[PDB]
Amino acid sequence: KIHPGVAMTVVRTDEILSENILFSSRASTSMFIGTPNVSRREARVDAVTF
Amino acid sequence: MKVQGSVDRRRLQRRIAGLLPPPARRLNISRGSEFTRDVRGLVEEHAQASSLSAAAVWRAG
Hints:
part of a larger assembly, 2 chains, A: little secondary structure, 0% helix, B: mainly alpha, 3 helices, flat, Triplex capsid protein 1 (chain B), Major capsid protein (chain A), virus, catc
């Protein structure tokens, strides 16, 4: 535990889980909705995925 | 005054009508419907192993 010629600065990142409050004013965005679909893909020897 | 000059258009229309339709995909969904016999068509898989009756073979295809 001799002190070497140099000293060191240490950096470390710490993280915190939090609960947030969000506010969003009235009629602030307009949305355009299109119709949904149904599609077939990847039929295997036992099953079919949609 | 209608000179026969090639294969009749009207007959080939009938024969290409059967080859045209491809397999169905991409059906759109309506909760106002919430289900359709059309969705069944897209979903059904329509398999083999008939019952050996004279018509049950034809019904199954």
